[PDB]
Design a protein around this ligand. Structure first.
Ligand SMILES: Cc1cc2nc3c(=O)[nH]c(=O)nc-3n(C[C@H](O)[C@H](O)[C@H](O)COP(=O)(O)O)c2cc1C
Ligand SMILES: [Ca+2]
Ligand SMILES: [Ca+2]
Ligand SMILES: [Ca+2]
Ligand SMILES: [Ca+2]
Lengths: 145, 189
């Protein structure tokens, strides 16, 4: 598994955390995004996470450590639940559908305020049955390409 | 400007894979509630929000709780009102029958209790006091003293007061790293 396409997406995903663009993710840059997503880890837990992915034990996470992890965790079974936990982050009402607003919400929380247009397209970017929404089936199909 | 959904999704999958692990390594906490008009359940899920800042809380109605569990708990929290004459709410009689039948407990876990009541009645928060007194007898260590939210004199205020104090104590007996710096909700100031 692992096609340059997927790797390249994981790099841009990595960048989302490495906001300052130095090539490493800090315990600080991690907390910021997790709290943006409604996750509430304690400072000591933040270092745990950083320490788990940090293979060179140098204090932070570089893309390689990020790729190393995601590539492994992806091809696994736990993904089942994890991918689903990823859905909930978006589906706040747990109605089984990620509506336009919900997607807006998360983005604005990530400090990314977009017009209602680019948001509706950011959806049809995976809306199999064109219902202007992303269900679980379409969400999981979008994670595993 | 912007991040393709397929990318963002991979990033949030990264965070989720991390929270899952630190969460399963936190200490489990069981929050039991019994309620007739729903005020105990609301406070119960509020207790869960506050406890989510350091622990792995679970909110569970008294009638869906299997006593067997008492033998594996680390910390049991109870939020229930009282009725009739020291009577339990509807969804609390099943557990009531049990807890008072139970003569022994090997796992001397930690527990704290908070009951909703109303000063008007002579048997104030009697059901909450009933389970609270029963647990000490059984051997469990009272984390914090039983609280009482008087329907007439600021229930929430009392709850929140007890919620926060019971939490700062839990972060203590369980050795919670960064104890004094955990950012809790805004309502508990
Ligand atoms: C018929 C009736 C009997 C009650 N008896 C008591 C009582 O003996 N002791 C007490 O502390 N509160 C008593 N209350 C007040 C409830 O404990 C209080 O209304 C509580 O807010 C309801 O909580 P809940 O929403 O969690 O069920 C009684 C209320 C009603 C309507
Ligand atoms: Ca960085
Ligand atoms: Ca590193
Ligand atoms: Ca939804
Ligand atoms: Ca759809």
């Amino acid at each position: 598994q692992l096609t340059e396409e997927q790797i390249a997406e994981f790099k841009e995903a990595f960048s989302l955390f490495d906001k300052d663009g130095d090539g490493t993710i800090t315990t600080k840059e991690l907390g910021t995004v997790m709290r943006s997503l409604g996750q509430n880890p304690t400072e000591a837990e933040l270092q745990d996470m950083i320490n788990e992915v940090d293979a060179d034990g140098n204090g932070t996470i570089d893309f390689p450590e990020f790729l190393t992890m995601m590539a492994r965790k992806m091809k696994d079974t736990d993904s089942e639940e994890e991918i689903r936990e990823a859905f909930r982050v978006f589906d706040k009402d747990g109605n089984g559908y990620i509506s336009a607003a919900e997607l807006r919400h998360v983005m604005t929380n990530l400090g990314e305020k977009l017009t209602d247009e680019e948001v509706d397209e950011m959806i049809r970017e995976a809306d199999i049955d064109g219902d202007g929404q992303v269900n679980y089936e379409e969400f999981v199909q979008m994670m595993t390409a | 400007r912007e991040i393709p959904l397929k990318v963002l999704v991979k990033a949030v999958l990264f965070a989720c894979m991390l929270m899952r692990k630190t969460m399963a390594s936190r200490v489990r906490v069981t929050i039991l509630f019994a309620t007739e008009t729903g005020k105990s359940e609301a406070l119960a899920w509020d207790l869960g929000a506050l406890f989510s800042c350091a622990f792995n809380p679970k909110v569970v109605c008294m009638d869906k709780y299997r006593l067997s569990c008492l033998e594996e708990e680390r910390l049991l929290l109870v939020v229930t009102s009282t009725f009739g004459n020291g009577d339990c709410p509807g969804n609390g009689e099943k557990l009531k029958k049990s807890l008072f039948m139970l003569k022994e407990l090997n796992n001397k876990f930690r527990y704290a209790v908070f009951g909703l009541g109303s000063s008007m009645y002579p048997r104030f928060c009697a059901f909450a006091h009933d389970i609270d007194q029963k647990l000490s007898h059984l051997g469990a260590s009272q984390l914090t003293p039983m609280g009482e939210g008087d329907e007439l004199s600021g229930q929430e205020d009392a709850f929140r007061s007890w919620a926060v104090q019971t939490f700062k104590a839990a972060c203590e007996t369980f050795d919670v790293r960064g104890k004094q710096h955990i950012q809790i909700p805004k309502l508990y100031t």
